[PDB]
Amino acid sequence: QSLYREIHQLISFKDVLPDKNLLPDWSSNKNPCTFDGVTCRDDKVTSIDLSSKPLNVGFSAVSSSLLSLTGLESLFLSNSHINGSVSGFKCSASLTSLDLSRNSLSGPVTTLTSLGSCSGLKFLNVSSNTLDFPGKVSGGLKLNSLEVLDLSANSISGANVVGWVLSDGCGELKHLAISGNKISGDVDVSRCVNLEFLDVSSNNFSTGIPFLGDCSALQHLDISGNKLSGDFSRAISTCTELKLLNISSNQFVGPIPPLPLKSLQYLSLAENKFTGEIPDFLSGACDTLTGLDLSGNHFYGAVPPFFGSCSLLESLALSSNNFSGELPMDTLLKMRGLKVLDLSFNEFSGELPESLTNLSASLLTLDLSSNNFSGPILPNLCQNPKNTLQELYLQNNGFTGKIPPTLSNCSELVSLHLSFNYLSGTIPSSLGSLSKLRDLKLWLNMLEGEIPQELMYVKTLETLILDFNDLTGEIPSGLSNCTNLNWISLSNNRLTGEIPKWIGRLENLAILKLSNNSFSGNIPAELGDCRSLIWLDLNTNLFNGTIPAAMFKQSGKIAANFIAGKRYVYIKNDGMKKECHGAGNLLEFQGIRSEQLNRLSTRNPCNITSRVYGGHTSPTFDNNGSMMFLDMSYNMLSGYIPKEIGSMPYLFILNLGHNDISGSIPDEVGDLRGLNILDLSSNKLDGRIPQAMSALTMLTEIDLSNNNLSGPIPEMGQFETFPPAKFLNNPGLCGYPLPRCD
Ligand SMILES: *[C@@H]1O[C@H](CO)[C@@H](O[C@@H]2O[C@H](CO)[C@@H](O[C@@H]3O[C@H](CO[C@H]4O[C@H](CO)[C@@H](O)[C@H](O)[C@@H]4O)[C@@H](O)[C@H](O[C@H]4O[C@H](CO)[C@@H](O)[C@H](O)[C@@H]4O)[C@@H]3O)[C@H](O)[C@H]2NC(C)=O)[C@H](O)[C@H]1NC(C)=O
Ligand SMILES: *[C@@H]1O[C@H](CO)[C@@H](O[C@@H]2O[C@H](CO)[C@@H](O[C@@H]3O[C@H](CO)[C@@H](O)[C@H](O[C@H]4O[C@H](CO)[C@@H](O)[C@H](O)[C@@H]4O)[C@@H]3O)[C@H](O)[C@H]2NC(C)=O)[C@H](O)[C@H]1NC(C)=O
Ligand SMILES: CC(C)[C@H](C)[C@@H](O)[C@H](O)[C@@H](C)[C@H]1CC[C@H]2[C@@H]3CC(=O)[C@H]4C[C@H](O)[C@H](O)C[C@]4(C)[C@H]3CC[C@]12C
Ligand SMILES: *[C@@H]1O[C@H](CO)[C@@H](O[C@@H]2O[C@H](CO)[C@@H](O)[C@H](O)[C@H]2NC(C)=O)[C@H](O)[C@H]1NC(C)=O
Ligand SMILES: *[C@@H]1O[C@H](CO)[C@@H](O[C@@H]2O[C@H](CO)[C@@H](O)[C@H](O)[C@H]2NC(C)=O)[C@H](O)[C@H]1NC(C)=O
Ligand SMILES: *[C@@H]1O[C@H](CO[C@@H]2O[C@@H](C)[C@@H](O)[C@@H](O)[C@@H]2O)[C@@H](O)[C@H](O)[C@H]1NC(C)=O
Ligand SMILES: *[C@@H]1O[C@H](CO)[C@@H](O)[C@H](O)[C@H]1NC(C)=O
Ligand SMILES: *[C@@H]1O[C@H](CO)[C@@H](O)[C@H](O)[C@H]1NC(C)=O
Ligand SMILES: *[C@@H]1O[C@H](CO)[C@@H](O)[C@H](O)[C@H]1NC(C)=O
Question: Per the Swiss-Prot or TrEMBL record, what residue ranges does the short sequence motif Cys pair 1 cover?
């Protein structure tokens, strides 16, 4: 307790740190109560917080210098790069809280039994470490005094690990968390009569439901993300005080069983296989319910009317079921607190309820996507003094009419998604007033007119998806102002003009898809200034001139990390139909059912059956990438292929077919390691296939037909795997699959 001991113990810790500048104001002839990270009371150290500092030392240093400090009551070393493992040590009787979370502690969890030296320990967070339970489950943690224990996000695989933790007693335990491991077996917390919080989620529990005994204090029960299928209703029947029940992402079946509803605030049965209709007994929860999630089940029927009495409800998730019918406009108006309404992926029908025109003052997310709704979009939505709606998802319905210009009064809008409908008219110029909008998606509609110049006022715009409409005119120069644009998709319209040279100012542009339009002029070399471009599809236009060598300037220097995480669809071209152009169509696909892709048969000549790939967008690099997709087929390009085309290691697809390209194939093609598809067919190419193409080991498809190439086909490589039709109409070429070179 002397200042001598305190300073020497604390400075001895600093003097084992690899980087001592992490504790710069810790100095030996200076009172510790003036140190950053120290907490004092009456000139005595009571707590130390060095969290989020890269200390890079072992637990042995912490136990010898800090945990032994007399009077220390708490030590917070979360995310501090403490490795090693726990061992015996002398612990201050005053220590009540120890936070060693988000570190690299290792060894068996039995190491934690030596923390019993801390006679006063009541709180222990050793989550996000690498502790394990190798071998057989035996003994006990023997930390009876703990009130809060978090062993989550470790490497604990085993059966009945919970029994080991609770073996020596759990009368004082109020909060137990063991999520994110691979624990299995039994969970008996019947003796833990003061347990208020239990989180055994994201484990490998596939047998019995936890035994909660009398359940007299349990307020929070989280068993989600396992493989449970038994009778949870009976196990929780006596739980009178339960406020949160999350049983989602399990293997439960059958109808919604009886539930304890007296105190229930949050309930999630999502991502299971429950069946039936929403039972009316749940009405008994409308006095307390603040959140409900029944998504990802096999529920059906209509939304019951008792939801009108659920006035405290702030989130109603019912998506991905077989719910049907029109929704009650009389029940929604009573949910004054509802801030999330997700009804997506069902078969609700009818017109939008006028209730929404009122709920626009409390809602942040309105998701009705992938339903059977019809009629016009509410022309009076967001008429309230303060409209808080941030996300409007109405895509993949049967909505008709015009896009209401009133939507600009939704000032807080961040995402507008009206794609896959039958909307007509123009893109309202008033949308330029949405100063916070990031996503404007309206593709597969019947929109006409031009792209509003007024989008120049939306500095926050990131995605502009307008494919498969009837838009005309040129690309408005006002988009140069939208400097955060990373995804621009304007395919299958009737647009004209040129690619403006100001495209180079869009530092964040990753995807530029302009196919099947009437764009013309030369390819702007300024495309080479786009530091983020990874997907350029210009197929089926009227572009002319030569391919500028400068496009590939940023090659190697590209680093698009911003686009990652966006739902998409890629419709591969079979090549069996001559009306279908291009390698394939990359299309945004948030909140849309792949089943409705057959709506495209009236706009696209391609066959979609069994050709649809999907996922969330994921670039193959982070910092030193190149262009991944380049399609400029079916234009009128001329000149030679710049040898800088081979500068892109990450290019998967290069489609330059159906042009007037001249010259010879530069040997640099062979440097395109990742090239899965390459065709230069229907062109004016000359010479012989560079022998360096044998470096290409990832080709699944090549087409060099309809050219004037001569000479032998490279003998090594993948060239022999391809049929002769991929080399046909080239009088000078010979060698298997063709006749051997005479
Ligand atoms: C009801 O129950 C469901 C199912 O359990 C919950 O839904 C899941 O919730 C989690 C948590 O939000 C969802 O995603 C999770 O994200 C985490 C990412 O954050 C961590 O990692 C990043 C990156 O390192 C760090 O920046 C950050 O600080 C965190 O450390 C993951 O930790 C989660 O686990 C997954 O990733 C980790 C990576 O360390 C792995 O160890 C895990 O095994 C796992 O792969 C997790 O992904 C998760 O997707 C949701 N699942 C669904 C909806 O199906 C509900 O939230 C819950 N609702 C309640 C209680 O109301
Ligand atoms: C044991 O330690 C772990 C690791 O630190 C810890 O897990 C982390 O908890 C925090 C808080 O519970 C999580 O971060 C929060 O996450 C939610 C949404 O997931 C946000 O609401 C939070 O931000 C709001 O609240 C903050 C106040 O905490 C405000 O500062 C902020 O402005 C927002 O209003 C916040 O981000 C975090 O995701 C986890 N997981 C990690 C870090 O991996 C765990 O809670 C600890 N356990 C115990 C029992 O103490
Ligand atoms: C970085 C983002 C923008 C991306 C959209 C990313 O998310 C996707 O994963 C992206 C990399 C995916 C979407 C479509 C895929 C192609 C689909 C296809 O027809 C395949 C045919 C054959 O099987 C070949 O061997 C491999 C081929 C060419 C595939 C390469 C990888 C692609 C491009
Ligand atoms: C904890 O981290 C430290 C620092 O990285 C590790 O120490 C290094 O260990 C390697 C491998 O044994 C040695 O080659 C280095 O010379 C060590 N350097 C320093 C500065 O420590 C330490 O091994 C880690 N501890 C554990 C248990 O993994
Ligand atoms: C958003 O709502 C306000 C409030 O109703 C509308 O205000 C009108 O603004 C025009 C000029 O733009 C005035 O001539 C009208 O008298 C206003 N009507 C009022 C105040 O009731 C505004 O037009 C709406 N904006 C959009 C794009 O629909
Ligand atoms: C490229 O094309 C430019 C525009 O040509 C005119 O408009 C296009 C859309 C077509 O309709 C075409 O027939 C028209 O003549 C020309 O100005 C330019 O010179 C062309 N460049 C080259 C290298 O041919
Ligand atoms: C989880 O349990 C299953 C059996 O239900 C087993 O096959 C699987 O290997 C286990 N996985 C783990 C512990 O990661
Ligand atoms: C879903 O509900 C609708 C409307 O009641 C019904 O026509 C349809 O067959 C149901 N689908 C399934 C798979 O049960
Ligand atoms: C959608 O609604 C229309 C009436 O507007 C109805 O005829 C049709 O069957 C509905 N489709 C589904 C799948 O419920």
Answer: 33-40
Distance, in Å, from the CA atom of 287 to the CA atom of 285, rounded to the nearest integer, reads 5
Between the CA of residue 159 and those of 136, 164, 203, what are the distances in Å?
A: 8, 10, 11
If you search the block for the tokens 């009705």, which residue do you land on? 368
Same domain, 724 and 641: yes
Beta strand spans in 519-639 (E): 520-521, 535-537, 542-546, 567-572, 584-588, 612-616, 629-631, 636-638
648 and 572, same structural domain? Answer: no
Say how many Å lie between the CA of residue 438 and the centre of ligand 8: 36
400 lines ligand 9 (CB under 6 A): no
Q: Is 415 annotated as a binding residue?
A: no
Chosen domain end from 251, 268, 294: 251
Q: Of the candidates 305, 336, 299, which has an alpha carbon nearest to the alpha carbon of residue 317? A: 299
Q: How many domains does the chain have?
A: 4
* CA 600 to centroid of ligand 3, rounded, Å: 21
- Cα–Cα distances (Å) from 285 to 329, 399, 695, in that order, read 21, 34, 66
User: 483 C-alpha to center of ligand 6: Å?
Assistant: 30
Annotated ligand binding at 634? The verdict is no
Tokens standing for 650?
Answer: 């990450």
Determine the distance separating the centroid of ligand 5 and the alpha carbon of 430, expressed in angstroms. 11
Domain end, chosen from 235, 251, 267, is at 251
Contacts of 260 (CB under 8 A, 6+ apart): 236, 237, 238, 239, 240, 242
- Inside any domain, residue 479: no
**Residue 10 near residue 30, CB atoms below 8 Å:** no
- Ligand 9 within 6 A of 31 CB? no
Looking at ligand 8, which atom is closest to the CA of residue 325?
A: 4
Contact 566, 619 (CB under 8 A): no
Ligand 9 pocket member 374 (CB < 6 A): yes
Ligand 4 pocket: which of 17, 83, 111 to mutate (most atoms <8 Å of CB)?
A: 83
Instruction: Say if ligand 2 is within 6 A of residue 102 CB.
Output: yes
Quick one: 164 and 42 in the same domain? Answer: no
Q: Is the CB of 326 under 6 A from ligand 8?
A: no
Q: How far is the centre of ligand 6, averaged over its atoms, from the C-alpha of 578 (Å)?
A: 25
Query: Ligand 6 centre and the CA of 545: distance in Å?
Result: 9
Q: Which atom of ligand 1 is nearest to the CA of 153?
A: 41
Question: What are the angstrom distances between the C-alpha of 85 and each of 99, 114, 145, 669?
Answer: 15, 11, 22, 52
Ligand nearest to the CA of 326: 9
Q: Is 676 annotated as a binding residue?
A: yes
Query: Taking a C-beta distance cutoff of 8 angstroms, is the pair 106, 112 a contact?
Result: no
Considering only CA atoms, which of 358, 390, 364, 277 is closest in space to residue 324? 277
Spatial distance between the Cα atoms of 710 and 529, rounded to a whole number of angstroms: 36
Closest ligand 9 atom to the C-alpha of 374? 5
CB–CB of 161/141 below 8 Å?
A: no
CATH number of the domain enclosing 677? 3.80.10.10
- Which amino acid is it at 91? C
* Cα separations in angstroms, 378 against 181, 354, 466, 714: 47, 7, 21, 63
* 215 and 198 share one domain: yes
Residue 66 lies in a domain: yes
Say whether 613 counts as a known binding-site residue.
yes
Identify whether residues 191 and 47 lie together within a single domain: no
Domain-embedded: residue 545: yes
CA distances from 740 to 194, 336, 707, 713, 735 (A): 84, 79, 19, 9, 4
* Residue 702, SS3 per DSSP: strand
CA distance linking residue 633 with residue 652, whole number of Å: 15
Q: Is the CB of 496 under 6 A from ligand 6?
A: no
Radius of gyration of the chain (CA): 32
Whether residue 348 contacts residue 371, with contact meaning beta carbons closer than 8 Å, is answered with: yes
- The verdict on residue 226 lying in a domain is yes
| Domain containing residue 213 | 132-251
